[PDB]
Design a binder for this molecule. Sequence first.
Ligand code: TA7
Ligand code: TA7
Lengths: 339, 341
Amino acid sequence: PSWPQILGRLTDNRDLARGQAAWAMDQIMTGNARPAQIAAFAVAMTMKAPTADEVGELAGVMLSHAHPLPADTVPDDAVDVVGTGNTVNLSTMAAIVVAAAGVPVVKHGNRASGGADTLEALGVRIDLGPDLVARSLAEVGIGFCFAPRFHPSYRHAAAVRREIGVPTVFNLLGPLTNPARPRAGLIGCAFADLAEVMAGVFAARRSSVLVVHGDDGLDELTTTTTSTIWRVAAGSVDKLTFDPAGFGFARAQLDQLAGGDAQANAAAVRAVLGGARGPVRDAVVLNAAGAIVAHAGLSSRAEWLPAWEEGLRRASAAIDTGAAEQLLARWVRFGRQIL
Amino acid sequence: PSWPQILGRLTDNRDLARGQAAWAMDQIMTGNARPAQIAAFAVAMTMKAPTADEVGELAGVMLSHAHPLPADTVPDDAVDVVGTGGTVNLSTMAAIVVAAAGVPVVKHGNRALSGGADTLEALGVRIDLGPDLVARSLAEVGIGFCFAPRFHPSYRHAAAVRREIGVPTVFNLLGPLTNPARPRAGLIGCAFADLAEVMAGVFAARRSSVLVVHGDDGLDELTTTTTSTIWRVAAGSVDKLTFDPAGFGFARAQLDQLAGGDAQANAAAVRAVLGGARGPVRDAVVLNAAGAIVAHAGLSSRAEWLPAWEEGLRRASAAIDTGAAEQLLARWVRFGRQILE
Ligand SMILES: COc1ccc(C(=O)CC(=O)C(F)(F)F)cc1
Ligand SMILES: COc1ccc(C(=O)CC(=O)C(F)(F)F)cc1
């Protein structure tokens, strides 16, 4: 195995042999890959079109280098709510709403607005060690794994990612390398082909996940139009077309849903959790419900439609009853009380 | 203009906007491109499939950073004989034969398996010479060699990345398109049919008289193992042709018979061929030398394809069998040894 061999195979538009993606990622994680080699691999893998097996090797090697949460501190029904990339506004709000509905949530991200930035603008302490993320989950029902603290060996790839800027297969790794390893979640992707790849990876993990792609390009469930959902459970995938109009959701415009910077997002979080109505609320409710449906897929034998009706009810209620606003405040309170 | 913009465009399999490739290359040449950005660009451009316009921008910017040869020192009808990589043994021998046939030759390359420059050094040729001495070599010997690191010092950042990733990229095309002497004709081989057509487009834009050649066995030269595709470039237009050496009496050969080796072995092969040794290596050398001579003729006329080749094959054969090729290499070595005094 070597870079000329692996890079050559990719530029020739061939899928890699089993273990080659893993070899490449291990070189990258151990500081043995030159920045040029990392970049070449990232780009070549992207333009070749990665397979689920390849991405599975990349994520798997990365996790083998990550710091875990302490034993028996992550509830086995914890969920993730995130997109691959911007809808940080939607995913941040959805995550808070899901937690306020009684579902444990553990997120994973970094400062870019990134997921971490919006949370910091709300007064949340994002940079916590494993022991305290665990406490946060137990005491608040939500936690955040700061990527630099849990994936320190990813620093070389991270530097290259910043330098080239363009999205690559590495953008898919965030959701697939949550160090808390939640077994469920709502995972958005901006590209349909890659969404399907991600669903394949989650399937092999026996997770209960909704991998979602707005047919308008959104890396969340959209209200602008239909969405494609890759419904993942019991080692298999159920691909379907999803229309929120069937749940009474008005059609919105794309410019209404797009996130902004950390402060603009924070302002939007405060307004929505305060009860402000509009397209942004609807999108948050929609994706929160999606996460709740995924959560139900773990234990409940509840069917698709009734699961959604209950998920939408619980999401809306988490906002309307002030539970979400109250949970965020409790989350901020927790970080301040650590000192 | 930015890397995310340019790299984003390529990963979406779109051709670049005008000037974007030029911007990228200028960043690379001035040392302002990070290795990761250079690598990303090279790979992305390769997998998208580069256009003639894009490569023309790369080559043009690279040339603007290069040291030129002195004014009025390069003969108007100088030719190049080179491959973009798989046959260094063949292009080197063909170059000497072409020079011996009276066609000025100016090559361009680097030390590498013996590279083009390495083989010549093994024969006693001084390869690392400034522009004034390359000019003198062309005048006094009829052949010259531009040492790439000497003429393209600002390319060091790109070359370091090329070695690191190892895989062939669009940058492998730049050698023949950035010859500092800027010969207007030549025999240019490429191991990839699609990239060969791109190069032909660039030479056409320059209104060069060139044969871009591709062995249908993956050879970056005219092969004797099988047929070859040839893009006849002349008068700003391109004619794509199939080429069978058998139509000129050449017997089919095996690929392993044209096998290069270390610099000492290639040198031995050069001495053998120039000494008149018959065989498939000679045949391949004569065939590629003739190709360059046909391209040279295209500068001053549009002679018929078949008789051009027959005269070219004849001239190349004569250059060897008169001893002219062997004598020219000796004059080349002699010239190099004279520089010290
Ligand atoms: C300096 O060390 C680091 C710098 C940046 C990062 C990330 O940025 C990773 C990230 O988002 C992930 F995809 F979630 F993993 C990790 C380590
Ligand atoms: C140390 O600085 C350098 C190192 C290597 C080279 C090349 O090797 C370029 C080359 O082949 C060309 F495309 F023909 F120009 C140039 C400068």
